[PDB]
PDB file of C-alpha atoms and ligand atoms in Angstrom:
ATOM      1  CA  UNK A   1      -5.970  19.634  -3.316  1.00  9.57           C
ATOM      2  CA  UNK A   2      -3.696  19.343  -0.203  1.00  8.03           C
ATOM      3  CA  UNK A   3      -0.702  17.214   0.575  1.00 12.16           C
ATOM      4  CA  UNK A   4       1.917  16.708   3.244  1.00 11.28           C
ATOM      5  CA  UNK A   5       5.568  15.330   3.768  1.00 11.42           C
ATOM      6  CA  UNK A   6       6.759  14.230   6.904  1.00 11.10           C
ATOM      7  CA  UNK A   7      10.333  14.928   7.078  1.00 12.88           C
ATOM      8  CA  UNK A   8      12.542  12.309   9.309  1.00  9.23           C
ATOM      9  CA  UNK A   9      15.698  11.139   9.447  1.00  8.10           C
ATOM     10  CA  UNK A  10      18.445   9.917  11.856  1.00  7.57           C
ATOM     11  CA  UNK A  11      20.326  13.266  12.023  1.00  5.44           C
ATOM     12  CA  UNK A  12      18.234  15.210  14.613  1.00  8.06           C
ATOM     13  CA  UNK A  13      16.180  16.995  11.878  1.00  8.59           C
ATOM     14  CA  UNK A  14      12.481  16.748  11.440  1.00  8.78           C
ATOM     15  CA  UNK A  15       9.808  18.449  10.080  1.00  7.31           C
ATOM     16  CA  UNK A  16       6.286  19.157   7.926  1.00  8.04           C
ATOM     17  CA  UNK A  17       5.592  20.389   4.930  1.00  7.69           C
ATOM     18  CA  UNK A  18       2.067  21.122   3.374  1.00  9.11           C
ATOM     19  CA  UNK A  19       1.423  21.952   0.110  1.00  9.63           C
ATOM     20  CA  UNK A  20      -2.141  23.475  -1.507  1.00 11.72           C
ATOM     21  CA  UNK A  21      -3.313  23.696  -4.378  1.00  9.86           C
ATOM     22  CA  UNK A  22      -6.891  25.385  -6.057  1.00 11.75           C
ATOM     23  CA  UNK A  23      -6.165  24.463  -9.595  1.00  8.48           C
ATOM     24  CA  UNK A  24      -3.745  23.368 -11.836  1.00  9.51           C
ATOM     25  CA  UNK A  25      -3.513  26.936 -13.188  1.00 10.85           C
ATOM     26  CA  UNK A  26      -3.141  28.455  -9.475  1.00  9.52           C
ATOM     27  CA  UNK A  27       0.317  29.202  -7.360  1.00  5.83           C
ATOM     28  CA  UNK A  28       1.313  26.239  -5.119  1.00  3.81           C
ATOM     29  CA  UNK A  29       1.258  27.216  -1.612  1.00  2.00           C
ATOM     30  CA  UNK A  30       3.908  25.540   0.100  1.00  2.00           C
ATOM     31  CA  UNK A  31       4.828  26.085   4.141  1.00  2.00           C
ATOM     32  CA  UNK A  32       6.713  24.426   6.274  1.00  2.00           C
ATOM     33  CA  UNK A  33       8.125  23.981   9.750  1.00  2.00           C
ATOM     34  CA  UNK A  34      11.306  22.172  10.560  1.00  2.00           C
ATOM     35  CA  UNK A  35      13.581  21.754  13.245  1.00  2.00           C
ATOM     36  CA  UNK A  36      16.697  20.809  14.545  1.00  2.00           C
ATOM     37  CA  UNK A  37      18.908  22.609  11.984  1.00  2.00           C
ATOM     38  CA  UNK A  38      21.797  24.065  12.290  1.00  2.00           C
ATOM     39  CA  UNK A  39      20.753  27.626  13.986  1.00  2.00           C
ATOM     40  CA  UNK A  40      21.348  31.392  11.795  1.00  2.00           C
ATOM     41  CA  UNK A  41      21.932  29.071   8.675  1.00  2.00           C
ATOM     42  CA  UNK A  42      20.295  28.703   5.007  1.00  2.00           C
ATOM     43  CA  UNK A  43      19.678  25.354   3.778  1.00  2.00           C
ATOM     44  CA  UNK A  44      18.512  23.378   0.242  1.00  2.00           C
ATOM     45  CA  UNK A  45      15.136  22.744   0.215  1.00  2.00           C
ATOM     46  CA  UNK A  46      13.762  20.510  -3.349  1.00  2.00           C
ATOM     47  CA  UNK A  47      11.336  18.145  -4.148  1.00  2.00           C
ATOM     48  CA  UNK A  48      13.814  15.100  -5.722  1.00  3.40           C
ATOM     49  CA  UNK A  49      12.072  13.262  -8.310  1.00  5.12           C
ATOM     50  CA  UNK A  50      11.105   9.625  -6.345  1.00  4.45           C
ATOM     51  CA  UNK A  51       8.773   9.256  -3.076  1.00  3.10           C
ATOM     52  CA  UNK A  52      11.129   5.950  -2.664  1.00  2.00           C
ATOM     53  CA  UNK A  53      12.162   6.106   0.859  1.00  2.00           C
ATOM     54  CA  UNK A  54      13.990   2.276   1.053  1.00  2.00           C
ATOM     55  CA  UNK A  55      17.612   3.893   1.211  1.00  2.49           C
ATOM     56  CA  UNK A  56      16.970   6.630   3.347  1.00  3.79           C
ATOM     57  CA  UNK A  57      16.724   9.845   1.132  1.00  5.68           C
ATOM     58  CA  UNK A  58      19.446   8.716  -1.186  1.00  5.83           C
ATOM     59  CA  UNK A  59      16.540   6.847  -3.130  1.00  5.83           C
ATOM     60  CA  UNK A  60      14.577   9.708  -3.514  1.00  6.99           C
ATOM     61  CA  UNK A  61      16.984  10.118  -6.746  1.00  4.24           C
ATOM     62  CA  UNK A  62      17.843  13.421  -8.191  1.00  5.36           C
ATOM     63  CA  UNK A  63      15.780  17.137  -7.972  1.00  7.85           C
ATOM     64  CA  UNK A  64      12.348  17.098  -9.619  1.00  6.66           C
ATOM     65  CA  UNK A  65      13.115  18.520 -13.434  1.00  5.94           C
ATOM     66  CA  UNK A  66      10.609  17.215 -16.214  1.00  6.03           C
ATOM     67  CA  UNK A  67      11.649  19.872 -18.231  1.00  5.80           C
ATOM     68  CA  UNK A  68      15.462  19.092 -18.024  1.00  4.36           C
ATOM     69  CA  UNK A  69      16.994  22.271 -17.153  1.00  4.05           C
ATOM     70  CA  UNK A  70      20.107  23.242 -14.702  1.00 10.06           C
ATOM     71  CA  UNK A  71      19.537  23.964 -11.090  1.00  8.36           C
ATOM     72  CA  UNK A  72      18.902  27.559 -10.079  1.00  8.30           C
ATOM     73  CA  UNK A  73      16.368  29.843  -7.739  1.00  8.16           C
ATOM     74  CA  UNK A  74      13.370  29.220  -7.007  1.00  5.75           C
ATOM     75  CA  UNK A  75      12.723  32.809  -8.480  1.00  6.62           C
ATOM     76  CA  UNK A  76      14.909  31.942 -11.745  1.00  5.86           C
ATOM     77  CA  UNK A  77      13.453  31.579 -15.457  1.00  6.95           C
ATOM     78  CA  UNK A  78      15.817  28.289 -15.747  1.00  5.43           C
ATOM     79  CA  UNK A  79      15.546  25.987 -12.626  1.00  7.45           C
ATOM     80  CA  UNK A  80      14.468  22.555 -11.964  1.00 10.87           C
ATOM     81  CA  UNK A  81      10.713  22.395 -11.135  1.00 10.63           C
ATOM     82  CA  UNK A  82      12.021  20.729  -7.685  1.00  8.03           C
ATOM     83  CA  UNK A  83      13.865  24.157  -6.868  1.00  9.63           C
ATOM     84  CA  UNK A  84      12.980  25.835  -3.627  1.00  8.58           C
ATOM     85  CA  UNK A  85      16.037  27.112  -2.790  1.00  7.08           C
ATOM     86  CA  UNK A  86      17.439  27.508   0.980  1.00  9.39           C
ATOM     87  CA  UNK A  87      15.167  27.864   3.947  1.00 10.89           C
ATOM     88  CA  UNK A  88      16.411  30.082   6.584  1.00  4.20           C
ATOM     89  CA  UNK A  89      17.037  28.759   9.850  1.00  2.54           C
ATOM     90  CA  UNK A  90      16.703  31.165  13.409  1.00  2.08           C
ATOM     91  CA  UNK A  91      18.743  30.875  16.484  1.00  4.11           C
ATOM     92  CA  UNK A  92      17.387  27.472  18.143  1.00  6.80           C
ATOM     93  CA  UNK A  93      17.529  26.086  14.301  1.00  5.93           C
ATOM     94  CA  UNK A  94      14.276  26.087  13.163  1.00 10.61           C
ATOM     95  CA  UNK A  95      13.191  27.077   9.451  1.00 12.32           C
ATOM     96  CA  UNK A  96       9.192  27.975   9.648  1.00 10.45           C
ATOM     97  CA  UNK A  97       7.241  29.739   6.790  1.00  9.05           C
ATOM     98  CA  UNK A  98       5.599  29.313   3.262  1.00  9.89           C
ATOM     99  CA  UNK A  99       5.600  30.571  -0.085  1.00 13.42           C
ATOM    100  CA  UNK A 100       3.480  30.302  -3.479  1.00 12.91           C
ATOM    101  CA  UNK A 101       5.155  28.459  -6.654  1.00 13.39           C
ATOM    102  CA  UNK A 102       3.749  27.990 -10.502  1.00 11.97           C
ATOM    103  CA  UNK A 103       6.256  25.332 -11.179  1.00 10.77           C
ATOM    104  CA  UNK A 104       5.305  22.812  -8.426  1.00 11.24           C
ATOM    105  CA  UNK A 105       1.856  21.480  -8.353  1.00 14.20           C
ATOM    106  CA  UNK A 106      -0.434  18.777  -7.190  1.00 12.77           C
ATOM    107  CA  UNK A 107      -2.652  18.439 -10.151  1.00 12.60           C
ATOM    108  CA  UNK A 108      -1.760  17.577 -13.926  1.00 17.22           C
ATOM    109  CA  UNK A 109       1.163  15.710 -15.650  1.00 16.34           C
ATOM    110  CA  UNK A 110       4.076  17.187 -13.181  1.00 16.42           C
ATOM    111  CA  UNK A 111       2.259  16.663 -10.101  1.00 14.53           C
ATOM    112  CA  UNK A 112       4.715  16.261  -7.155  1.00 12.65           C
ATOM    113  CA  UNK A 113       2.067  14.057  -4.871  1.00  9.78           C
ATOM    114  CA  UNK A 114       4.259  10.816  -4.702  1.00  8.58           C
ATOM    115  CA  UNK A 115       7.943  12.333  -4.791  1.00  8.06           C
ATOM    116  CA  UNK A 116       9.889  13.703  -2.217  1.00  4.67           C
ATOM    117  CA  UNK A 117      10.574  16.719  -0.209  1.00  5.77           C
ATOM    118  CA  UNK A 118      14.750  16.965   1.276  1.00  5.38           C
ATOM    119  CA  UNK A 119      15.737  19.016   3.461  1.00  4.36           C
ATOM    120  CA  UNK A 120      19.720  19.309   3.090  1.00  4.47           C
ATOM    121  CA  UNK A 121      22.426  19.593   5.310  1.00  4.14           C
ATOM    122  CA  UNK A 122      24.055  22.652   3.441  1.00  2.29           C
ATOM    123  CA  UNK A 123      23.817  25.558   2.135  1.00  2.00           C
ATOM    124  CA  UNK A 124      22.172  25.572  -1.833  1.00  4.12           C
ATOM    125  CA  UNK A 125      24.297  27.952  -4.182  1.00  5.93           C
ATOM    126  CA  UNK A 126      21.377  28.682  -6.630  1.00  6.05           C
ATOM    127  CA  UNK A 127      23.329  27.114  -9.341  1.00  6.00           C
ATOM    128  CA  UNK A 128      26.071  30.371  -8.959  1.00  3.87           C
ATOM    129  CA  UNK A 129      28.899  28.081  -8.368  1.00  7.41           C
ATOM    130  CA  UNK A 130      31.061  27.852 -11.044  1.00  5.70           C
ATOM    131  CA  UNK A 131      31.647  24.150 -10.942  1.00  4.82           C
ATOM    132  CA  UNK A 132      29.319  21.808 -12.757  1.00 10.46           C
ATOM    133  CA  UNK A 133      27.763  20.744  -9.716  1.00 11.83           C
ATOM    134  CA  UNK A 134      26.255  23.904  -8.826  1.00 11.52           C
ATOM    135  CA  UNK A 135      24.417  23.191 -12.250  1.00  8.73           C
ATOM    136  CA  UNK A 136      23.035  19.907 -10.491  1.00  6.36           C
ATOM    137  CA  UNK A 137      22.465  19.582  -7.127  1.00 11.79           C
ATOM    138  CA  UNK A 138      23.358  23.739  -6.054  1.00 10.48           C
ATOM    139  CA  UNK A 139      25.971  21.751  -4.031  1.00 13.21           C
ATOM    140  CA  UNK A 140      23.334  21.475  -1.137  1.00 10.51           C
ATOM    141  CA  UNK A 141      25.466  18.273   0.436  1.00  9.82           C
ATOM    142  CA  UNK A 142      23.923  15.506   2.266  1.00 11.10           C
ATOM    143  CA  UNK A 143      19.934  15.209   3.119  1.00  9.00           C
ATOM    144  CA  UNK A 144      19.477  14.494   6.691  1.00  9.70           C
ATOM    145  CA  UNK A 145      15.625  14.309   6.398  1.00  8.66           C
ATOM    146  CA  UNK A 146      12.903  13.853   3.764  1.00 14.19           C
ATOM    147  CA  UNK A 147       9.532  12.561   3.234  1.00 14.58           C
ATOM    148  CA  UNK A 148       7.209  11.359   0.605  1.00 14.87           C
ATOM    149  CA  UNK A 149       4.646  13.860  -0.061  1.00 14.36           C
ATOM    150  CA  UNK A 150       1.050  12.138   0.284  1.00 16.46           C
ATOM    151  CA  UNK A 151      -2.408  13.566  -0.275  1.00 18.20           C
ATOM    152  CA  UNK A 152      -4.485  14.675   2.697  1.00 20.22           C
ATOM    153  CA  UNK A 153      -7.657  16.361   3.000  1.00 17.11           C
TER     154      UNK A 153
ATOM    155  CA  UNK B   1       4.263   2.364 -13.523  1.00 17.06           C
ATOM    156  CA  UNK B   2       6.394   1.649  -9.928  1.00 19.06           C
ATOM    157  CA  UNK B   3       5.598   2.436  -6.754  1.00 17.32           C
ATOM    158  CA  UNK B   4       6.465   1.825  -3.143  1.00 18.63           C
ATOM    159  CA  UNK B   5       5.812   2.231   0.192  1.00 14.31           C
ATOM    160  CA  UNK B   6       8.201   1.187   3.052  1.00 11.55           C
ATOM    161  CA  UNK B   7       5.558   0.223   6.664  1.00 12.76           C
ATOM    162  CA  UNK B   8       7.275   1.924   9.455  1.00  9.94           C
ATOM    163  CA  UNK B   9       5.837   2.126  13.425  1.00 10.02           C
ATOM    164  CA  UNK B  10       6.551   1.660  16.771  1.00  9.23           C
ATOM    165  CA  UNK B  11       5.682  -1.910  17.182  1.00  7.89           C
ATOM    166  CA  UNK B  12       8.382  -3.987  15.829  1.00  7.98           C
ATOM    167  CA  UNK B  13       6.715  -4.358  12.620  1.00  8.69           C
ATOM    168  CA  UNK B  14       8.089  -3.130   9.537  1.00 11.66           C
ATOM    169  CA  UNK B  15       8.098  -4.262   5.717  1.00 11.36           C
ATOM    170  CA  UNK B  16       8.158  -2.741   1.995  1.00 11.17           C
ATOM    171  CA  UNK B  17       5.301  -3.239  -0.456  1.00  8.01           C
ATOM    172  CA  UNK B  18       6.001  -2.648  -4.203  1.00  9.53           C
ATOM    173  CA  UNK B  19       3.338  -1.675  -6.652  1.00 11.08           C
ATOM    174  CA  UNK B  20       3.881  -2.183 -11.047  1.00  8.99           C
ATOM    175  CA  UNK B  21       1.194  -1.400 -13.258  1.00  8.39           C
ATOM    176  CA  UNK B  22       2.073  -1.229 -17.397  1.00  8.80           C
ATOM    177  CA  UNK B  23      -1.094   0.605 -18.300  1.00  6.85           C
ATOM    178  CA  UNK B  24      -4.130   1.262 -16.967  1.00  7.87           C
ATOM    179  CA  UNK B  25      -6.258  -1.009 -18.332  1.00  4.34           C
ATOM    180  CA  UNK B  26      -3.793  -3.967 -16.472  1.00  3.95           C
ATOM    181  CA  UNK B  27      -4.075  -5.652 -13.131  1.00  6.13           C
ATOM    182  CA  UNK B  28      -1.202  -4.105 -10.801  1.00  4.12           C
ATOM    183  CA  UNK B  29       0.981  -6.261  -9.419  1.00  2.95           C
ATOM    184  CA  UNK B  30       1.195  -6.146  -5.511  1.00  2.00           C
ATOM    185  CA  UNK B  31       4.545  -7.877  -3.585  1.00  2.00           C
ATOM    186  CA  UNK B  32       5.251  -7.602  -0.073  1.00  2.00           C
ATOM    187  CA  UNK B  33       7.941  -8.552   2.416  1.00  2.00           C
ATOM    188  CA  UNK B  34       6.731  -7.644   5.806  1.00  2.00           C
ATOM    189  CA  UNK B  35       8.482  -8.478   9.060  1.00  2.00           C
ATOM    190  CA  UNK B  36       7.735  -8.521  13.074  1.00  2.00           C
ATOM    191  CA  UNK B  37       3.923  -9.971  13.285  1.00  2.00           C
ATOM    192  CA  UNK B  38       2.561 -12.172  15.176  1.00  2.00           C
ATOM    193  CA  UNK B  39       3.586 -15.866  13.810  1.00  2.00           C
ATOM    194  CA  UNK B  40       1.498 -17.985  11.438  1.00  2.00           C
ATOM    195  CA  UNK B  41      -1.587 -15.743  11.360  1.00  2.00           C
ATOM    196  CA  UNK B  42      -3.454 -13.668   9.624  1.00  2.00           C
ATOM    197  CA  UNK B  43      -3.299 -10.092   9.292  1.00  2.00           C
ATOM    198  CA  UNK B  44      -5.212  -7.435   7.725  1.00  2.00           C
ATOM    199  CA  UNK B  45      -3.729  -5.579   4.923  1.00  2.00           C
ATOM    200  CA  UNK B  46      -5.331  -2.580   3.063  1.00  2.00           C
ATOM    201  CA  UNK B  47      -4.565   0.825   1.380  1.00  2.00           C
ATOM    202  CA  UNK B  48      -6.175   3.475   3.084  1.00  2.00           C
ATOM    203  CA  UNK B  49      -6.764   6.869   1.637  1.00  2.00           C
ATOM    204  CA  UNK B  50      -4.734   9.474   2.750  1.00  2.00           C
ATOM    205  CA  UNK B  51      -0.745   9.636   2.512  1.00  2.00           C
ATOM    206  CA  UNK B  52      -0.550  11.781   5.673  1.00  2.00           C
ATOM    207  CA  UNK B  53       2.062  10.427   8.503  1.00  2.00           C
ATOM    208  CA  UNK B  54       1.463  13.863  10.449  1.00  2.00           C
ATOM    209  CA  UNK B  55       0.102  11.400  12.875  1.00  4.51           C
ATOM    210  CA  UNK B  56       1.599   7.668  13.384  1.00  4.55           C
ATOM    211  CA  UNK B  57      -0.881   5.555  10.891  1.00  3.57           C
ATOM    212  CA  UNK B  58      -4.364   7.367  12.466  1.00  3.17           C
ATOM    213  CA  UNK B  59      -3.981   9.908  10.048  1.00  3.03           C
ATOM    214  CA  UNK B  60      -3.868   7.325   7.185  1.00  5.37           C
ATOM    215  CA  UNK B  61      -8.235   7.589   7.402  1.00  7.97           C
ATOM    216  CA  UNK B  62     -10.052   5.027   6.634  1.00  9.35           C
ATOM    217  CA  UNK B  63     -10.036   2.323   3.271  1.00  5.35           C
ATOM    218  CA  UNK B  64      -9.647   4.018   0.292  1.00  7.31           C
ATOM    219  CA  UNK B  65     -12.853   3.545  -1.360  1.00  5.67           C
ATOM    220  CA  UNK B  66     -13.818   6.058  -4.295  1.00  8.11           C
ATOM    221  CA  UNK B  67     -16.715   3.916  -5.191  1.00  6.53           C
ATOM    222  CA  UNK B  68     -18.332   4.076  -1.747  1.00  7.00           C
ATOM    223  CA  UNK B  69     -19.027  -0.158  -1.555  1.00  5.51           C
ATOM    224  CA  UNK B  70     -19.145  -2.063   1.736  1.00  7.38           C
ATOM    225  CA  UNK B  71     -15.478  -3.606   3.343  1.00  7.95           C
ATOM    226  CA  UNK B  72     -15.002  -7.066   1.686  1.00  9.88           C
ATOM    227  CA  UNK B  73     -12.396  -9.933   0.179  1.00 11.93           C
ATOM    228  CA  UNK B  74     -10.109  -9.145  -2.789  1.00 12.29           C
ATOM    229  CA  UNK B  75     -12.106 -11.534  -4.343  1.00 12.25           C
ATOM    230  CA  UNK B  76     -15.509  -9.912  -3.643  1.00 10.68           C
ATOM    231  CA  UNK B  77     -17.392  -8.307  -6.199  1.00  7.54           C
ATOM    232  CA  UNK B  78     -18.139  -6.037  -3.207  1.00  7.63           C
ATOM    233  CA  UNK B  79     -15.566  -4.510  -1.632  1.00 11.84           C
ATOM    234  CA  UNK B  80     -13.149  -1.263  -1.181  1.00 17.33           C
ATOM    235  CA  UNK B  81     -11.110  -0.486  -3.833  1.00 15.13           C
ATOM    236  CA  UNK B  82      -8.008  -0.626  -1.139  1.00 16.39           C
ATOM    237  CA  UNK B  83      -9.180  -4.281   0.180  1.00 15.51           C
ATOM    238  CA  UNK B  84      -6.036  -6.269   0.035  1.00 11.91           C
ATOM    239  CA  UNK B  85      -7.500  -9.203   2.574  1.00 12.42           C
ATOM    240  CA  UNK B  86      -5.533 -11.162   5.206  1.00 13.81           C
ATOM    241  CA  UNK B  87      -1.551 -11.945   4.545  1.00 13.92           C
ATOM    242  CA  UNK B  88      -0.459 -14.938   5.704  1.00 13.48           C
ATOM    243  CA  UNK B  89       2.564 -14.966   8.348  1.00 13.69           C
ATOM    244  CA  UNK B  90       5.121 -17.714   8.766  1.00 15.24           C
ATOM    245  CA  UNK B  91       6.671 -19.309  11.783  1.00 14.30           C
ATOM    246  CA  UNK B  92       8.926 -16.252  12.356  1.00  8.80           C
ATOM    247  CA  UNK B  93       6.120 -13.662  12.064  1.00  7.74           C
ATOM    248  CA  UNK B  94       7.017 -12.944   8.093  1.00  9.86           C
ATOM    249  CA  UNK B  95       4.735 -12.031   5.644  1.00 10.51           C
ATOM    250  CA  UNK B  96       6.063 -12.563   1.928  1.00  9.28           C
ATOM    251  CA  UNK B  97       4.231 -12.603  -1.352  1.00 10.88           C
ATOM    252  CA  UNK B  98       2.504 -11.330  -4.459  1.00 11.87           C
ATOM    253  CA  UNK B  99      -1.008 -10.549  -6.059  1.00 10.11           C
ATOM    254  CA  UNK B 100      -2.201  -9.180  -8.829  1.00 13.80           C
ATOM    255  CA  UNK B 101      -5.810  -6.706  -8.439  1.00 14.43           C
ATOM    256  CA  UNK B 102      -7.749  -4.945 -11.274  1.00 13.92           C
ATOM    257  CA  UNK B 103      -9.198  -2.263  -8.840  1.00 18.44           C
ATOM    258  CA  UNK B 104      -6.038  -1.485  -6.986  1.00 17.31           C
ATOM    259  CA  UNK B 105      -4.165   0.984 -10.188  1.00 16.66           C
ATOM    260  CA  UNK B 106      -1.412   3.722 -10.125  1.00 19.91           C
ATOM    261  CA  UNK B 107      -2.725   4.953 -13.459  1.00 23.09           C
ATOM    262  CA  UNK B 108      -5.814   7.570 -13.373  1.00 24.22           C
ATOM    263  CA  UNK B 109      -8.635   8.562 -11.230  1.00 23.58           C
ATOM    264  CA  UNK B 110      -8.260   6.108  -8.741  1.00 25.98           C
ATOM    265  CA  UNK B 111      -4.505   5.746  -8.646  1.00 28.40           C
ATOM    266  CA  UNK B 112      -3.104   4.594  -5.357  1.00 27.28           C
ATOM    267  CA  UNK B 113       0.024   6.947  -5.875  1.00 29.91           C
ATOM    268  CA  UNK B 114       0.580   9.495  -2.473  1.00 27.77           C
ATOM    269  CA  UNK B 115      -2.290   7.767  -0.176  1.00 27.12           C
ATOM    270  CA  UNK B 116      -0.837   4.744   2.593  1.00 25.35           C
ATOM    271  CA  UNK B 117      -0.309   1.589   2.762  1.00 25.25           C
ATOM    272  CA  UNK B 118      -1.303   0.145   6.338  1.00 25.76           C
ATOM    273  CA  UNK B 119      -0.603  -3.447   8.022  1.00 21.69           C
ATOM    274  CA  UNK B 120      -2.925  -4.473  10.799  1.00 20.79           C
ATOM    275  CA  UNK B 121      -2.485  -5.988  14.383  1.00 14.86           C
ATOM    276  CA  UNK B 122      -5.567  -8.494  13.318  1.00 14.26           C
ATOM    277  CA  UNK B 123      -7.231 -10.257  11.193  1.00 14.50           C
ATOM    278  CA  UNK B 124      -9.474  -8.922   8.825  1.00 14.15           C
ATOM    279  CA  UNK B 125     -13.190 -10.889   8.891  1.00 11.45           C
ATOM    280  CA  UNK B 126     -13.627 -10.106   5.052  1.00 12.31           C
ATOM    281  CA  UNK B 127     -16.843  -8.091   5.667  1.00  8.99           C
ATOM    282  CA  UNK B 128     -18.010 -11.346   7.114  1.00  7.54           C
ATOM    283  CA  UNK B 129     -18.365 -10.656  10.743  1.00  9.16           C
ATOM    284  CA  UNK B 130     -22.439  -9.664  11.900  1.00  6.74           C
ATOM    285  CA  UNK B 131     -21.241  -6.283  13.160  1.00  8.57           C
ATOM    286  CA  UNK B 132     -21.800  -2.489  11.281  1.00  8.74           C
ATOM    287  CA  UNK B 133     -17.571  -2.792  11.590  1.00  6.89           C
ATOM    288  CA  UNK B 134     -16.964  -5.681   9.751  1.00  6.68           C
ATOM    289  CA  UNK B 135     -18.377  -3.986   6.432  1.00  7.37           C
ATOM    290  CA  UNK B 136     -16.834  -0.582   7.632  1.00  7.08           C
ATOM    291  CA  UNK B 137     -12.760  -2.432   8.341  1.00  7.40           C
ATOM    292  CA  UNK B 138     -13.585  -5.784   8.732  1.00  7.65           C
ATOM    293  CA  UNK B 139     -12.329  -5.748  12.468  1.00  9.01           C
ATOM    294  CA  UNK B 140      -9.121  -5.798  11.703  1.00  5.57           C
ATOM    295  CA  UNK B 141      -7.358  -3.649  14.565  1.00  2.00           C
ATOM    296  CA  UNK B 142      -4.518  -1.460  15.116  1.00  2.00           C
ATOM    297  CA  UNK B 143      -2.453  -0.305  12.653  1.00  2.00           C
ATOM    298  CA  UNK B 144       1.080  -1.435  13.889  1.00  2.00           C
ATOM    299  CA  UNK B 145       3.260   0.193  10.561  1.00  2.00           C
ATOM    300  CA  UNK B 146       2.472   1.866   7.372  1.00  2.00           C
ATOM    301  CA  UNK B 147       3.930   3.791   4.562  1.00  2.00           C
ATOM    302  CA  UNK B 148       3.035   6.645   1.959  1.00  2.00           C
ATOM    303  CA  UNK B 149       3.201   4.883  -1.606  1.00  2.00           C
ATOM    304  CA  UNK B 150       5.681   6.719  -3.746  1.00  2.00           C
ATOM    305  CA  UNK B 151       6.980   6.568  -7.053  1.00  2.00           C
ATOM    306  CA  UNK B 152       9.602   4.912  -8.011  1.00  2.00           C
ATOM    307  CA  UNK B 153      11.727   3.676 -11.395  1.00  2.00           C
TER     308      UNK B 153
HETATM  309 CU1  CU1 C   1      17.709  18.417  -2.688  1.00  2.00          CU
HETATM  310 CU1  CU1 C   2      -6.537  -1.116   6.965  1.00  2.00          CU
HETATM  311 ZN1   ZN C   3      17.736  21.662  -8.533  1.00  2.00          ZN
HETATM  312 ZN1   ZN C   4     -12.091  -2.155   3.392  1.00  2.00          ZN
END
């Protein structure tokens, strides 16, 4: 199964990102290319739980978590599903690459096909704040571009 | 079940279709609000079956149709499971109403969830023109907006 989000926005960031998966059982393989970033930075990356796009991305709700635990690393035991953690912009601000994920998939009961990928404005502290927003949203800050992830072929 | 899709393009046309199925056994509930066509015609209104925006509404494909039947009416016994016929636009180019369709589900198999929703720059023929077209999109023309249906609450 494939799918793709178009990332837009009025902000000056843009961008695609694919997603493939085998089988339900198999790794997600997720890459992506976006630009117009702010250049050497990181920046929160997560699939938000609605593919709703009539308020911009504030619509797309909160991140992705079926399983209702706190925000953390994408590489964390407790994270949402939605949790991709920060994407790492170069010099002319562009974020480009891919990685595999079991929590995110395309098939089954927690497929995201239909939510939304947001690309975020700030840095994402993994959930290592200590406030009780780093437990939410990583404290990420405002999403300048997202896109509802559709299936392809 | 809610979905949605908000129709974005180039061409002045623009609109939000909303999507509620209870289970999937029922007849989802289609209402639309779309804004910038021509005035009192007819336009061509269908769900195609791909949700990829990677390019304008080409990449939509063609009608979603699992089944593999001819292009036809809603009301056909024959037609494409995305076949949503003409909607009607007022004096100031609106297009504003609600069906309900028994093929058309965001439940299962055939759900409608992450492919596109696509409004035409014609009028669809039904599957009623003598051309090889007609059955295939019913000559309905460009595709002026569309949107990836998403979930919603
Ligand atoms: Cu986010
Ligand atoms: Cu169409
Ligand atoms: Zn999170
Ligand atoms: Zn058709």
């Amino acid at each position: 199964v494939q799918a793709v989000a178009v990332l837009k926005g009025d902000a000056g960031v843009s961008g695609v990102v694919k997603f493939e998966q085998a089988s339900e059982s198999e790794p997600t393989t997720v890459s992506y290319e976006i630009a117009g970033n702010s250049p050497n930075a990181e920046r929160g990356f997560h699939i938000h739980e609605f593919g709703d796009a009539t308020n911009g991305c504030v619509s797309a709700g909160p991140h992705f978590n079926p399983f209702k635990k706190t925000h953390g690393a994408p590489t964390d035991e407790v994270r949402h599903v939605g949790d991709m953690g920060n994407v790492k912009t170069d010099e002319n601000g562009v974020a480009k690459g891919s990685f595999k994920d079991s929590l995110i998939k395309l098939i089954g009961p927690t497929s995201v096909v239909g939510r939304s990928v947001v690309i975020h404005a700030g840095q994402d502290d993994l959930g290592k704040g200590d406030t009780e927003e780093s437990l939410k949203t990583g404290n990420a800050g405002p999403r300048p571009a997202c896109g509802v992830i559709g299936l392809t072929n």
